[PDB]
Every structure is written in C-alpha cells, then in structure tokens.
C-alpha cells in the first residue's frame, strides 16, 4: 500500500496511546513467553533444549532443523491458553517491526524523523495497537493483506521454478500434488492430493537448506521486516 | 506507452548531445589557445585570512 | 585533477533507445554457458549460481558496443587503459571471491591442499597450496592483461597496415599508366587480401576474447560450487 | 669518473628479440592443425566439433604472440 | 569437487601415530608437538581438518593482494640511507619571552 | 609514437584542478556541520562511522617515524628520479 | 561533548606542520595508539566472552569435546574444565538478532566510550603542552579557528642552521 | 644576495631538511627581489609578485611537512640492522 | 502481479539491484573508487607538460603559469594576504625598501 | 682507474630476451590442444572431461608466461 | 656526465632477429602438410576438407610470419 | 653530448641472422618428405595426389625462406 496523508494523521493522533498499549501488551506477552519458555526448558526434548546443530551437506552452514529444533508442546493448554498464544504471536510481529524502527532511530539519531514521517504515512509497518477503532483496524488489515499479495507470488514462483528446472517428481501422484499445489486461490485444492509434495520437497529441500533469497521472500509474505 | 514516450525524449536528448559533441564542442587544451579551455582551479579559500 | 569527458557511445545509445523501445527476443548469446551450468539432471545447487547472468550480459553488451565498432576508422575505445581494465576485473573477481569467503565455510578450501595423504605435507602439498592461491590472482591478472593486449596489438597492426596502404595507393597509383603496372596491380591485390583478412581476424578475435573473459569468471565461480543430488 | 650514456639504437635490438617469440607461437599453431587433420581422419563424425576446439586453441596460442608483439611496438615506438 | 563429510570420532587416528619433522613426538616429547609445524600439519591432514592449512594461506594472499600491497607501496618505509638525517630535537619549543594563551577554564 | 597517440579519448571537454588541502578542509567543515547538532549523540554509530576511522588514520600518520624521506605529494615536478624536491 | 569535530582540524594541521612535532607530542600520539590497541583487545575479549556464554550447549560440547588435536593431556583437562563450567549452570542461549545484539551492543558501547574518553584525554594532554602544538590547540579552543603558519608567526624554535628566516 | 645551489649533483649528497630549507630560502629571495623591482617601478606588488608568492607557499608546504626521525631505540636498531659492516663495505666498493 | 523491474521506478530498482542483488559488487566498486580518488587523482605540472596536452605543451604562452597566476591573485585578493610580510620575503619591510632603492 | 658507466638503453635488450620465453609457452599450449584434438577422436564420450583438463594446463602454462611478461614491464618501465 | 649516443647500423641487427621468427613459421607450415599426408593416406576419401583446413592453418601461420615481417622491414627503414 | 656513429660491419651481422631462418625452412622440408614416405607406404594408391600436396607444402615453406632471404641480401649489399 502507498502512503497517504489521512493515514499519517491517523497514526500521528494515535501515536502515544499506541505506544502505551504496546507497552502493556509487552508486559503481558513477556509473562506469556516466560511461562512458555520455562515449560519448554523443563519438559522440552534434550535436542530442542540443547539446540542441536544441523549442518548443510554442501557448505556445512548451521540452520534450524524442523524435526529437532522444533517441538510441539502437547500439554501447553494446562499453563497457557489459545488466546494467550495468539496474543503472543501478534505481539511478536508488532515487536519485530517496532524493534527495527527503534534500531533505526538509535543508529541515526535525530535524522530518522523524516523517515518516521514516511513510516507513519503507511500502515504496512505500524503496530496493530495504533488503531483505536474498527475502521482503522480494517484499513491496517487491508494494508497487511496488500503486502502479502505483493510478496507471496514471488516466493511461490521461486520455489516452483527452482524445483521444476532442477528436478522432476518421481511418480504420478507426486506430479499431481506438485501441479495442484500452486493453483490460484479461485479453485479449491484438496489437501490429501497435495500432501505428497511435502515428502517430495523434503527429498529436494528441507527447512534447514532454505536459501536466503527465498527466506527473504517468505519473510516479506509473513509481514516480517527484512531490513 | 510509457517506454515509448520516455525513449522518444531520450532519443531527442541523445541526438542533441551527439550533435553538440561531434560538431560544436571544442577540445580542451588546444596548442594555439583558439578553442577550448586551458583549465582552472576551484574550491579556493575565500575570506579566511588566518589560513595564510 | 578532475577531467570531464564522454564515452563514444552516444549514437549507439540513441540507436538502442530507438530500436529497443519495444520488446524483442534474444536467442544468440556470446557466452551461453552462464545460463547452463548444470548438465546432469537431478543436480541442484543451494548457492546463487545464476547471479552472474545479468552482469555477464551487460558486460558483453558494453564490450561489444566498444570493441566491435572500433574496427570502424577513427572510432575510439574510451576505456582502453590497463589499470581501468584491472579495476573492472578486480571488481568482478574479488566480489565473487568475497561472496564465497563471506560464506564462512572453511572446508570449501580443502581442495586447495593438492595431492593425497601419501605426498609429504610440508614439502609438496603446502607448496602446491601456495602456488594455487597465487594462481587465482594470476588468473585475474592474466584475464585483464589478455583483454588489454589483444585489442592494443590488433589496433596497432591495423593502423600500421592502413598507413602503408594509403601511402602506396596515393603515391604509386600512377604506375597503372606505366610499364610496371603489373607489379602495382599485384601489390594492390595483396593489400586488399590482407585488409579483408585482418578485418575478419579482428572481428572473430573480439568476440572470442569476450567469451574467454566471461569464461574465466565463470570458472572461478564453478571452482567453488557444490551440487547436491535429488532423492 | 661518473659517466652516463644513452644509446638510442638499442630499442631496435630488443624489438627484434621479441619477434622471436612468434617462432614458438607460429609453430604451436601449426601443431594444433596437424593434430586436427590426423584426428579428423580418425573420427570424421566430429570434424565440426574438433574444428571448434582447434580455433579456440589457436586464439589462446595467438594471444601470447600478441603479448610479445606489444612489447616490440612499445620499444620500437619509444 | 565432491561433497565433504566430516570423519566420525572413531575414524580419527590417535595423536601418537602422527609424525613430525624427524619422527613421532610420543611420550616424553608430547609438549614438542606444539612447536613442530610439520607434526601439526600431518595431524590436521589425518583429522581431515585440512582447511587449517589452506584457509590461512589464501586469506593471506588476498590480504596482500588487496590492502597491504598498496599500503606498502604508497606508505611503506624504504631502506634507510647511508648518511642519516637524525633529528636534533630543537624544533617546536616556544621562544623565550612568549606569553602562551591561557588554557580553557 | 604517432600510432600510439591514436589510443586517447577523443571527447575531452574540461579539466578542473583543486588542492587536496582545500577540498579536504571543505569536507571536514561539511562533516562537522552535519555531525554537530545535539540530536546526534557522540555514541551513535553514524557519528563514530564519520569520525573514528579518520582519527585513526591521522594518528597513524602522526605516529609515523620513517628513516627514509617521502617526497611531497604535490610537488611541481615529480618526473625527475634524481630530485625528490 | 564532541571532541572529534574540534580535534580533526588540529590533527590535519599537525600533519601539515609535522616538522614542529616535539618528541612529547610524538609520545602522546604513541600512547594514543597503544590505548586504541588496548581498547580493541578488551572489546574483543568481551565479545568472545559474550559469544561463549550465549553459545548453545551442543555447540559447546562439540567445540570443547573429543577429539583432541594435540592430545597432550593439558588440552583435554582445560577443555573439560571449561565445558563443565559452562554447562553446570543455566545460560540464556538466544539465536538470531538477539545473540547479535547481546554480543555486539556491549562491545560497541565499551569500545566507543573508551575511545571517546581517550580522545578527551589526548585533548587535555595537548592543552597542557608547552610547545607550538599546545599553543595551537589552545588558540583553536579559544577562537574556534585553526591559525595556520602560526609557528613562523610566533617564531617557534628552529635548528641552529635554519634560523636565517627569522632574521628580521 | 646569493642563491644556494640545489642542482641534482649538489642535492645528491645533502640531507632532505637542508635541501628543503635551501629551496625555501631561494624562493624567499626571489620573491623579495621581485617585490623590490615592483616597488622601484611603483606598480602594485600583487600584479607582479603572485607567482613568486605561490612558489614560496609551495616550498613552505613541502618544508613544514617533513619532520626528521627521532633517534631512539627502534630507529637505531633498524639502522644498525640494515647497515651492517658487510653492507657498508659493499657500498664503499661500489663506484656508482 | 508485482515485479521489481516492471513496477518500481528506476531509482528504487537501482537501490534494490545494488543492495539485494549485487551488494558485494557495489561495495567493491565503492572501495575501488575511493582508492582511485585517494591515490590516482593528482598530476604534476611537469607530467601535464609531458603528456597532458594533445599536440604538446605550448611553451610559447605557458598557460600553466597563467593559470597559477590567476589562482594566486584570486587567493591573495580574497583572503587579504600581505605578500610583503617578512615570512614571505625573509626580510623586514625596511630592508625591502633599501633593496628596492638599491636595485 | 675507477670508471662508472651507465648505459641507458640496455633495458630494451633484457625485455626482448624475457619476451622470448613466450615461444615455449605458446608451443606448449599448441601441444596441449593438439593432444586434445587427437584424444577426443579416440574417446568422444569423455570430450568434455578432457577439455577441462586442457584448460587447466593452459591456466598452469599461461601463468609462467606472466612472470616473464612481468619482468619485461619491471625493466621496460625502469 | 650526460652523453647521448646514436648508433646507426643497429637497425640491421634488429631486422635480422625478426627474420628468425620465420623459422618457426616455416617449420609450422611444413608440420601441417606432413600431418595432412598421413590423414589423407589413412582416410583417402577426405582429400578436400582436410586440404581446406590445411590452407586455413597455413593462412594463420602465414599471418604470424607477416606480423614479424612488418617489423623486419619497418626497422630496416627506420 | 650528441654523438653519431656509423659502424660499417653491422650490415654483416644482420645478414647472418636472416640466414638462420632458413634452418626453420629446411627442416620443414624434411618433415613434409619425412611423412610423405609414410603416407605412400600406408596408401600406395595415392602416390600422386600426396606428392602434389607435398610439393605445395614445400613451395609454401620455401616461400617463407625466400622472404627471409630477401632481407639477408638487402642488408648484405646495403
Ligand atoms: C545506547 C547505545 C546504543 C548502541 C548503538 C545501537 C545502534 C542500533 C542497533 C540496534 C540496537 C537495538 C535496537 C532496539 C531493539 C529492541 C530490543 C530487542 O532486541 O528487541 C527484541 C527483538 C528480538 O528479535 P528476534 O528475532 O525475536 O530475536 C530472536 C531471539 O531468539 C529472541 O530470543 P527468545 O526467542 O528467547 O525471545 C526473547 C524475548 C522474549 O521477550 C518477549 O517476548 C517480550 C518483549 C521483549 C522485547 C521488547 C522489544 C521492544 C522494542 C520496541 C521498543 C519501543 C520503541 C519505541 C519507539 C518510539 C520512541 C519514541 O525477549 C527479547 O526480545 C530478548 C532479546 C535479547 C536482548 C537483546 C538486547 C541486547 C542489547 C541491550 C543490552 C545492552 C547492554 C550494554 C552493556 C554495556 C557494557 C559496557 O529485536 C529485534 O527485533 C532485533 C533487532 C532488529 C534490528 C537489527 C538492526 C541491526 C543490529 C546490528 C547490531 C550489531 C551490534 C551493535 C553495533 C552496530 C554497529 C553497526
Ligand atoms: C516522529 C516519528 C516517530 C519517531 C521516529 C520513529 C522511527 C522512524 C524511523 C524508522 C522508519 C522505518 C520505516 C520507513 C518506511 C518508509 C521508507 C521509505 O523511504 O519508503 C519510500 C518512500 C515512499 O514510500 P511509500 O510511498 O509509502 O511506498 C512504500 C512501498 O511499500 C514500497 O516499499 P518497498 O519495499 O518497495 O521500498 C523499499 C525501497 C526504499 O527506497 C526507496 O523507495 C528509495 C527512496 C528514495 C527515492 C528518491 C527518488 C527521488 C530522487 C530525487 C533526486 C533529486 C531531484 C532534484 C532535487 C532538486 C532540489 C533543488 O528500497 C529499499 O528498501 C532499499 C534499501 C537500501 C538500503 C541502503 C543501504 C546502504 C548501505 C551502504 C553499504 C555499506 C556496506 C558495509 C560497509 C562497511 C565498511 C566498514 O519514499 C519517499 O517517500 C521518497 C522521498 C523522497 C524525498 C525527496 C528526495 C530526496 C531529498 C534529499 C534531501 C537532502 C538534503 C540535504 C542535502 C545536502 C547536500 C550537501
Ligand atoms: C537513475 C539514478 C537515480 C539515483 C540513484 C542514486 C545513486 C545510487 C548509487 C549507488 C546505489 C547502490 C549502493 C549500494 C551500496 C552497498 C549496499 C550493500 O552492500 O548492502 C548490503 C546489505 C543489503 O541489505 P539487506 O538488509 O540485505 O537488504 C536490503 C534490501 O534493500 C531490503 O529490501 P526488502 O524488500 O527486503 O525490505 C524492504 C523494507 C523492509 O522493511 C523493514 O525492514 C522495516 C523498516 C526498517 C527501517 C530501517 C531499520 C534499520 C535498523 C538499523 C540498521 C543498522 C544501522 C547501523 C548503524 C548506522 C550506520 C550509519 O525495508 C525498507 O523499506 C528499507 C527502507 C530504507 C530507506 C532508506 C534508503 C536510502 C535512501 C537515502 C537516505 C540516506 C541518504 C544519505 C545521503 C544524503 C545525506 C544528505 O546492507 C545491509 O546489510 C544493510 C545495513 C544498513 C546499515 C545502515 C546504513 C549504512 C549506510 C550509511 C547510512 C548513512 C545515513 C546518513 C543519514 C543522513 C546524514 C546527513
Ligand atoms: C564551471 C564550469 C561548469 C562545470 C562545473 C563542474 C563542477 C564539477 C564539480 C567537481 C566534480 C569532481 C568530480 C568530477 C568527475 C568527472 C568524471 C567524468 O567526467 O567521468 C566521465 C563520465 C562519462 O560518462 P558517459 O559514459 O559519457 O555517460 C555520461 C553521460 O552524461 C550520458 O549518460 P546517460 O545518458 O546514461 O545519462 C542519463 C541520461 C539519459 O539520456 C537522456 O536523458 C538524454 C540526454 C542526455 C544529457 C546528458 C549528456 C550531455 C551531453 C553533452 C552536453 C549537452 C549539451 C549542453 C549544452 C551546454 C551549452 C553551454 O539522462 C541524463 O543525462 C539526465 C539529465 C537530462 C537533462 C535534460 C535537461 C532538459 C532541460 C530543458 C529545459 C527547457 C526550458 C524551456 C524554457 C521555455 C521558456 C519559454 O562522466 C560521468 O559519468 C558523469 C560525471 C559527472 C560528475 C559530477 C559533476 C558535478 C555536476 C556538474 C553539473 C554542472 C551543471 C551546470 C553547467 C552549466 C553550463 C556550463
Ligand atoms: C568473517 C570474514 C570472512 C570473509 C573474509 C573476506 C576477506 C578475505 C580475508 C582476508 C582479509 C582481506 C583484506 C580485506 C580488507 C579488510 C581491511 C584490512 O585489511 O584492514 C587491515 C588494517 C591493517 O592496518 P593498517 O591500516 O595497515 O595500519 C597498520 C597498523 O598496524 C595499524 O595500527 P593500529 O593502531 O590500528 O593497531 C593495529 C593492531 C591491531 O591489534 C590491536 O589493536 C591489538 C590486538 C587486538 C585483538 C582483538 C581481539 C582478539 C581476541 C581477544 C581475546 C579473546 C579470548 C578471551 C578469553 C581468553 C581466555 C584465556 O595491530 C598491530 O599494530 C599489531 C600489534 C601486534 C602485537 C603483538 C605483540 C606480541 C605478542 C602477541 C602476539 C604473539 C603471541 C604468541 C603466543 C605464543 C604462544 C605459544 O587494519 C588492521 O588490521 C587494524 C585495524 C583493525 C583491527 C581489527 C582487530 C580484530 C581482527 C579480527 C579478529 C578475530 C577474527 C580472526 C580470527 C578468526 C578465527 C576463526
Ligand atoms: C559504524 C559502525 C561500524 C562497525 C564496524 C564493525 C563491523 C560491523 C558491525 C556489525 C554490523 C551488523 C551485522 C554484523 C554481522 C551479523 C552476522 C549475523 O547475522 O550473525 C548471526 C549470529 C546469530 O546466529 P546464531 O545461530 O545465534 O549463531 C551463529 C551460528 O553459530 C552460525 O553457525 P555456522 O554453521 O555458520 O558456524 C560458523 C560460524 C561460527 O562463528 C560464529 O557464528 C560465532 C560468532 C563469531 C565468533 C568470532 C570470534 C572467533 C574467535 C576469534 C579469536 C581471535 C584471537 C586473536 C588473538 C590475537 C592475539 C594477539 O561462522 C564462522 O565460522 C565465522 C568465524 C569468523 C571468522 C573470521 C575471519 C576473519 C579473517 C580476517 C582476515 C584479516 C583481516 C585484516 C588483518 C587483521 C590483522 C592485522 O550472530 C552471531 O553469532 C554473532 C554476531 C556478532 C555480530 C557482530 C557484532 C559487532 C560488534 C562491533 C563492536 C566494535 C565496533 C567498532 C566501531 C568502530 C567505530 C565506528
Ligand atoms: C575497562 C578497562 C579500564 C582501564 C582503566 C585504566 C587501568 C589502569 C592503567 C593501565 C596501565 C596503563 O599503563 C600504560 O602502560 C603502557 C606501557 O605498558 C604505556 O605505554 C607506553 O609504553 C609503551 C611501551 O610499548 C609504548 O608503546 C607507548 O607508546 C607508551 O605510551 C601507557 O602510556 C600506559 O598508560
């Protein structure tokens, strides 16, 4: 979404209330994350807690492994509720963007003010707390969805083109899953037909071998700041 | 459409530049001094008596 | 000292604007090997091995606009300087080398230590590693030197031969009306043949040198590429 | 006593020496084509491919001769 | 060329098997392993840690080909002359009777 | 000689000269003007980027104690090998 | 206070008029260089310590575990001691931007603070000097401008064989 | 007045500081001579003495930049290390 | 759909190209530019006379001397420099007057 | 008597002599490609692998010429 | 002392050296034809394609000999 | 000082060097006839076409020899 004067006025008016709400959310999310981290450290598997190293087979560069470095706490409901988890995720996004902005401010002193004016003129990188009414929240969500639309096709095309140019599926079912995986949203994709693509790509590329450009595209599509 | 207009203007500018360069612009530092500049200094201090 | 000058491509820039305001397909490329690095299927690389395509195409375009058109008399190769070519090759080669080094994978350099465990490490293998590390920089220097020297020598020879041809054509054409016309005709035919041969040779050599210039960079890149197999 | 002498004509001698480098290059090029003929008669189906490799070798070998020729011009024109 | 796989802990030969410049630096000579460069090279080759030999070399070349080469060429100190112009340590001092300005306060 | 003269740029238009001292001083003035305002604390990465490397280089120059003589960078004549002055 | 903005002009002038550099000023600059090296060393030590503290448990086990390159016995003892010391207590082992911040921000802050205060110290030292450089520094801090050709204006000391120019 | 000899032959066996000072003195002498001529003619000095002033300026810049090295432990160590007895004998033998 | 080359304007695409596509090359180029302007941006008058002119230095008018004369005149006039100061001349003003009367 | 003489055009001779070393480099390159052309016709299926080794020899053969070329400049420009 | 000397007859020496560059060129040409006969004798049906390549090799080798010959005549007239 | 010297025995030295190139030609002749015999033995039916091609090779190689020989005689009488 392009910046505008109306959004600039909206964000300037709600700047300090937004900061206060962000601080309150920060306290709440710190509590939630403290609970979750204590539970992970206490009941987590040895590999997950010790941060086992998984290196690539070509350049031996460490990256997170989906099987070992990711763990699902099946018994987290006892300590943390679903709503708390959703709140933590939203706060993580908002805190990421706020941290990048604060880093820019600290780095450039008082010279970031015009860049701050550019920032407040667009809802793409402002926290959700800056919206105090339903219409403002709707506009903010629209901006986020616009950014997702802008970013996702590049990631999908990167993945599909690389795989198709450097590899082909083994069997017919894998072919069907691969072809139907990248259909447009106007048609409904059957998850059962599409699932084998997961194993096929695990054969091709895992999350531990994800390239940096593809990662940048994915982070763009997840509204995660990249600079 | 955009590129056609931009390239039309670029072509006119490059045509003018080519004409000026290859038919009007004199070469610097001529032996006779009849054409072109011999160079000069810039960024000279001004209003700084303490500098000397 | 600040000198203001211009390249000799303004007319060619005008032609590019005129003839490429609309799209056109490209099917013939001087260095096609930058697009097809992998020839065995199911092999793939996690490194950005296709990053050099754009630079390769732009360099080919620039050097072709300069060198090929330089055969036209009085056309100037504005970039024809030894240290400028050194700067260009330094940029490209060192940028790719630092891309490989910033990866912080020291095992990538294991192949520098040439030979097997049977060979003495200190007196054979270490010396070979030293020589290879030196040979990388020597390859860069050789690339830029070759590119410079080929053009310089070709154009020197062309200028000298053209001067000789002008001299004989102007100051000895009257021999056509004289009794020694046959000698002049033979000399003139030989000069025409040499003219054609030199032009063909230069045309071919320019393209070939550009091919080699890009191939050296691609070889640098390939020397550190590792291919995984799909399963 | 300190005497400094500058002989002009020496540049001719150095120029002629560099030309000797062409003897190896000219011979080297002929070697490539000799193998090319003796290879095309052993596998004519690849004549076009071999001709391509022969030309590449000719340029690399020729490139060296230019290096020497450049030095000849430098000294001959200085 | 091909992919590199680090050796397993059981595939690494013992340190005592490594040889130095003259011979193995076994018991009563272990502390000499630190000083013997050839022994360290052979140990690294045995442990497949060849990069320790190659990485310092290449980087060094780069460091000379990039930054130190020109630094030496443009700012390096050449050989000193026979007759040396040493400093008499007489320059710089203020003259007698000069009234220096007061320091900030 | 004449054939060698054919390898020169053919579209030289203007040449400008400037002393190193003058434009270095002007650059220092600009840097001070832009780094002076209070809203750029000295501990900011921008200020350190601006100042620290220059300070280090100048200190290295001052500390230099070379037994040889380095001729002035901007002499009138630097083509005579037997006259460093 | 921003001492670098004031000191850059003085350093450039000294380089231009380095002839009048007394041995005291040379010692001052050598001490500044030594303190810069010391600050670099301490900042690097802090960075290494922070990196080691935040390192993952498996990473520490791999780094400070078998095999031993030398296998002298002291190497293994030291590695085991360090590994036990690190793995005994609980350590915050962040990854990504968090580790970057933790390892860098303290190091940058320490290095910058030390360098800034050493620059202030050098400014004070040059203020206390009784040479032409000290007078130039004092005049710069007083009038705010660098007075070039000062040594010849106030007739700073010269070698006995070069005093003819002052003969007026 | 008398100009110093700053020819290559004379400069060869001279310390850098002495040569720089001699160049500066020659520049000053030439500048004052030109100024005296201008004053005798009555014409403005700026319109006649500009080039001499510039020469004096450049010689001043060259002269003030050079600081002879201090004789200390490391400098003496370097000088003795390079100038060994063998090297001194070789230099004496060489006629160049 | 969105593409950097087709949707973004030229400056934005330039920044993106040289920051997220060829950043190392740009860094090396800037380094080399700085080196060239720090060590290869000077030309002495003798060098200019030898090689700095297309057909040769026209000694019959010495444009370098005129250029330096204009430079020094401008500097003196703008900065209000007293070229008669003893430091420039090496002698007092009275000695200068005596010399003028002598010659 | 002690007489010191400086002949100022001798660096041309040394430069030409160093340039002569390029004849061997050119000849060696021609030999490599001559063997390549006569070897591909024998085992065409491995043509590509041979070409890689042929270039390697050129890379290790052209480098030697650079040293000789390097000396030429160090004496031609001094 | 500064002494400038101009030796006239040196141009004869330099010219003779460049003539030596034709030794390899003449040898190289002879090598091509010698290989051509073997290829024709071992593959008699290709008596024209081989002949064309032999001519091409001769032309390139002749070109190298002519580059040197230009210096040989140029110095002789300098 | 400007000194002009004219040595009248250096037109001999250049002549001798130009004669050296003949060796590269004479050896080239033997190579063509060295391989002609082998080709005749391999394929006696082509004793004629091979002989004609060998004559072509010898003539072209001799052409290089006479180009060098021209320089040899010019400097002998001048
Ligand atoms: C004054 C000096 C200044 C120096 C110069 C600085 C120049 C600017 C550089 C940037 C500095 C930081 C800027 C502020 C960031 C905000 C704080 C923060 O870390 O946010 C968390 C967040 C962590 O990100 P993450 O990816 O989630 O972390 C993954 C970890 O696994 C996360 O671990 P986890 O999964 O276990 O989750 C933990 C999480 C769980 O907690 C929660 O979930 C609760 C929320 C906690 C975080 C809240 C952040 C709020 C941010 C917004 C603040 C308000 C802004 C208001 C703006 C408007 C004001 C008017 O809690 C954390 O986030 C803890 C992270 C670790 C702490 C990092 C801080 C270390 C430095 C501070 C101490 C310094 C001591 C000095 C001692 C000196 C001794 C001599 O920070 C970021 O978003 C990362 C920064 C993004 C910008 C990067 C820019 C480049 C940086 C390069 C630095 C290189 C070194 C320095 C030299 C530079 C030279 C060029
Ligand atoms: C009070 C507030 C609260 C407190 C403060 C809070 C904190 C605030 C700060 C933090 C805020 C963060 C978020 C910011 C978001 C907005 C960012 C932004 O700018 O968005 C684009 C923003 C528009 O954004 P938008 O419309 O919302 O669209 C956003 C889309 O989502 C499009 O999105 P996109 O992603 O496609 O766009 C991204 C685009 C962003 O970029 C752009 O879009 C380009 C913006 C500039 C375009 C300029 C075009 C016009 C040029 C005009 C030229 C002059 C004309 C003639 C003038 C004549 C005047 C008389 O590309 C990039 O991100 C590239 C990044 C490049 C990074 C560069 C890093 C360099 C590193 C160097 C290498 C180091 C290596 C290591 C070395 C180590 C050595 C030891 O651009 C503008 O608004 C354009 C402004 C143009 C101003 C006028 C022209 C310049 C005037 C200069 C005046 C100079 C005066 C002094 C002169 C002195 C002379 C001596
Ligand atoms: C036709 C001609 C037209 C005109 C052409 C003009 C001439 C251009 C010629 C040359 C162009 C190419 C130059 C390339 C250089 C080499 C680049 C390179 O090696 O990059 C590697 C690498 C590539 O970056 P990347 O992160 O991989 O991705 C870059 C993509 O563009 C990221 O893209 P993305 O899509 O992934 O993310 C999009 C989005 C994602 O959204 C976000 O990330 C959220 C928002 C983030 C806000 C920023 C957070 C920053 C956090 C702290 C960063 C570390 C600070 C370090 C300490 C400070 C050092 C100063 O991010 C943004 O929207 C970024 C907005 C940035 C706006 C500013 C862009 C520059 C405009 C000019 C302003 C400055 C003018 C100064 C000169 C004039 C003065 C009078 O760079 C970095 O790692 C970034 C380091 C950044 C360090 C800070 C900047 C250092 C440079 C000096 C700053 C001086 C400031 C002066 C202030 C005023 C003083 C008076
Ligand atoms: C003191 C005397 C004056 C001089 C002062 C200089 C001050 C210097 C300060 C110190 C600088 C130190 C460092 C210097 C390093 C130099 C290195 C160098 O030269 O490298 C060679 C290198 C050569 O590159 P190249 O490969 O030849 O390509 C560059 C070309 O520009 C072509 O590249 P391109 O085609 O890729 O470029 C993009 C091109 C894309 O193509 C085009 O846009 C086509 C047009 C091309 C124009 C540019 C070519 C110029 C051709 C020659 C001149 C044309 C005729 C001028 C007539 C003058 C008559 C006196 O677009 C443009 O050029 C954009 C500008 C378009 C302007 C259009 C204006 C329209 C006005 C319409 C008005 C209508 C009014 C109606 C009123 C009605 C009332 C009723 O130069 C450069 O790369 C650029 C160097 C520039 C360095 C910065 C210099 C500072 C800025 C000075 C501006 C002075 C303005 C005031 C002048 C006033 C008249 C006297
Ligand atoms: C990750 C990247 C991968 C990709 C790489 C891509 C590139 C290719 C690679 C090759 C590089 C290519 C070059 C590209 C251009 C880059 C720029 C450049 O070349 O600039 C050079 C440029 C050269 O300087 P320059 O401008 O030519 O001026 C020369 C002057 O010397 C300047 O004067 P200054 O005042 O600046 O002082 C400089 C000073 C720099 O040094 C210092 O300032 C002091 C030391 C700093 C240490 C830093 C921290 C190290 C760690 C501390 C401890 C940690 C552990 C703590 C816990 C311990 C527990 C027990 O050095 C010296 O002057 C020499 C002093 C040496 C004293 C030796 C005294 C004797 C006793 C010690 C040695 C012998 C020990 C024998 C033991 C025997 C036992 C049996 O800059 C410098 O080198 C100096 C400034 C920067 C200093 C950075 C210091 C940190 C370096 C990194 C250390 C960590 C990484 C390495 C190890 C990694 C292991 C995995
Ligand atoms: C204006 C400001 C200017 C700033 C200038 C300073 C530089 C820029 C500042 C920072 C800029 C922001 C971005 C930085 C890069 C971020 C990289 C990143 O994303 O890391 C993520 C990563 C987090 O991911 P993770 O999953 O948690 O862990 C990584 C995985 O392990 C990854 O797993 P893996 O599988 O990849 O494992 C491999 C990994 C393993 O490494 C790691 O990741 C561990 C952390 C690094 C350890 C480094 C120390 C190693 C030991 C050194 C021992 C030295 C002993 C010397 C003794 C000398 C005695 C005399 O990488 C390596 O193996 C690399 C090792 C390093 C090799 C260094 C080679 C240097 C060659 C030098 C050549 C010659 C130079 C010239 C000549 C000099 C001498 C004359 O971050 C880190 O691990 C640490 C980040 C630290 C960031 C830098 C902090 C900067 C602090 C600056 C303070 C000083 C300021 C001075 C200012 C001056 C005035 C302006
Ligand atoms: C967080 C750390 C804070 C540290 C605060 C201060 C700690 C106490 C003082 C530390 C010691 C200081 O003592 C320091 O000694 C060294 C010599 O070894 C001196 O250095 C002196 O001799 C060395 C000898 O090589 C010279 O290189 C140097 O140029 C010269 O100045 C320093 O001028 C002095 O300051």
UniProtKB/TrEMBL annotation, chain A:
Transmembrane segment boundaries: 98-121
Superkingdom of origin organism: Eukaryota
UniProt entry keywords in alphabetical sequence: Membrane, Transmembrane, Transmembrane helix
Any GO CC annotation of this UniProt entry: mitochondrion
Protein name: Letm1 RBD domain-containing protein
Protein source organism: Trypanosoma brucei brucei (strain 927/4 GUTat10.1)
Range covered out of full length: 1 to 227 of 396
TrEMBL record, chain F:
Top-level taxon of origin: Eukaryota
Single GO cellular component term: mitochondrion
Name of the protein: Uncharacterized protein
Organism field: Trypanosoma brucei brucei (strain 927/4 GUTat10.1)
Lineage, uppermost ranks: Eukaryota, Discoba, Euglenozoa, Kinetoplastea, Metakinetoplastina
Encoding gene, per UniProt annotation: Tb06.3D8.274
TrEMBL record, chain G:
Protein name, entry field: Transmembrane protein
Tree of life domain: Eukaryota
Keywords: Membrane, Transmembrane, Transmembrane helix
Transmembrane portions of the chain: 38-56, 96-114
Keyword Membrane found: yes
UniProtKB/TrEMBL annotation, chain H:
Region annotated Disordered, chain positions: 1-17
Biased composition (Basic and acidic residues): 1-7
Gene Ontology CC: ciliary plasm; cytoplasm; nuclear lumen
Protein name: Uncharacterized protein
Source organism of this protein record: Trypanosoma brucei brucei (strain 927/4 GUTat10.1)
Source organism phylogeny: Eukaryota, Discoba, Euglenozoa, Kinetoplastea, Metakinetoplastina
Gene: Tb05.27M3.50
